[PDB]
Amino acid sequence: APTNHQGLLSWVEEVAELTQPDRVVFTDGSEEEFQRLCDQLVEAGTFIRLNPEKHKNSYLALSDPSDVARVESRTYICSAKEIDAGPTNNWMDPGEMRSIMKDLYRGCMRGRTMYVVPFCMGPLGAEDPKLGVEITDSEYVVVSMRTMTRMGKAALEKMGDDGFFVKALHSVGAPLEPGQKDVAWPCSETKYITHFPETREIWSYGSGYGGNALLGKKCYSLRIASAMAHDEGWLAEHMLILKLISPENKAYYFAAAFPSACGKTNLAMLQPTIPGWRAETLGDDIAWMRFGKDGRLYAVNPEFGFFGVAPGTNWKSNPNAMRTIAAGNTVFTNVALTDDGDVWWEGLEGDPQHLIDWKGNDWYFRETETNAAHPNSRYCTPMSQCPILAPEWDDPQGVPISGILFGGRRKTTVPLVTEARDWQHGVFIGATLGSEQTAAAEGKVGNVRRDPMAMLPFLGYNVGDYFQHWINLGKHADESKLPKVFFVNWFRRGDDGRFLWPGFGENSRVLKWIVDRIEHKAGGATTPIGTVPAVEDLDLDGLDVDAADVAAALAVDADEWRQELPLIEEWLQFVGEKLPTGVKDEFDALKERLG
């Protein structure tokens, strides 16, 4: 082993004695190692190599269809006390959990190689690099971790001899007995994704898929990290980071939290529609925000790659995503395969009459009743291949945030854009973020789900304490230096069910109002829920849209808002005993202004 970190070595020994793998392998993150792992993945049938002419060094992997299921009920925050997980989290006593998972882990890696994968979340040049080591028996995980994090030799050296690091244990939970033939995608029917916040540990078992197995993606970046940030005085958030550049060439940085399927990728890849405006991205999922010497809040993307949703993506919908993929070095999971060895998914241009679907079965145009690609299939691709990546993406100091945006899907009630009255009000609007989405295993059609700061399934501690944490950071900061907070809604619909606002690139007009507000040069009316622009405060020059529709999108109707109040109240009761008085005070204030 290429290290003298004895704490690390002891942990590897202890784990290997439990899981009993055939051998242990430390990964260094080199290109020859990568090519070697891929070659082995092709041999196992886990990867198929894509036609080099269309894709350089790119692969397709098809998972076991039972391993793509949503696993929120199998995801746990195992703090010592239940109150410290809170009502948004699944809790189990830590001792009870360990006894369950130790039973599962004992002998689990029999007949398999056990990889030890060191990695860095965020740029290496940082002063306190957040380091982790993932142990996994999945080669697929190793390859994808290489793309999604700064993996290997550099992070291992940054660990020194006694540097702290997050212990991330993973197993697919499919031991092989000496005779046994493996399968392309091993996994178990028993799945746990468990987090021990006080010790900063992640124990995953039974799934080899996505955020369950690539332990930097959500487990580290939000769950464990939010707990760290809680204790250390910063923010680990589900936010894209956008760099907006004015015609006068001034850069404004925004962090925006939207729940999944509410537009984070599209805003991150914004192509402004107002002449002279440009946009670049630093990330579309996770933001780590820390106060600098400036007194300003600086954001860094702790990830190194994109794990984007394939279906829906095309040269019209997202040319920048397509260009990122075209450069190669990409792993597609659960998409379809064309007759000429290209990949395809619903929404991608082309009209393939026959495909091989994501289960290896023949698929036929206007015949086969199932999607060719899984509806939440993924591509995993390097960030550095993104043509609109901002040059400061690998800057350990991060970028100063001028604005924080919250938003979700609301057919009614919530205006296109609102500015918060002040920081505490901003925390309130984040805290009560609603979105008209639901899932199978939940049902509840028509429901308004509250997804606080877009963090409902990602908080590593009590949601009330989290709100208090947000409150405290602002309370103790230079008020003038804090980002302004904004609430947006792209999804308001008219009486006919049309979108009142066209959105996508035209959202650059909303961001322009936001910039203008930052620069103290735009108007906005005081309403009960905040400052909302009139239609003439927005730049609609060049936009073929009905002024009356824009006015409706911006409307704050006191009745709609009064009907909204009992929804907010029952959410705030659900938050429970740790609901901060600051959030309570803001609800009362809102109620008073609505009268």
Ligand SMILES: Nc1nc2c(ncn2[C@@H]2O[C@H](COP(=O)(O)OP(=O)(O)O)[C@@H](O)[C@H]2O)c(=O)[nH]1
């Ligand atoms: N009407 C409308 N739809 C949008 C807008 N932005 C994104 N969407 C749609 O919302 C869905 C999810 O968008 P995406 O950017 O992938 O969301 P993400 O999962 O949060 O990254 C897609 O079907 C988009 O077409 C918008 O500004 N207006």
Ligand SMILES: [Mn+2]
């Ligand atoms: Mn996305």
Ligand SMILES: [Zn+2]
């Ligand atoms: Zn996400």
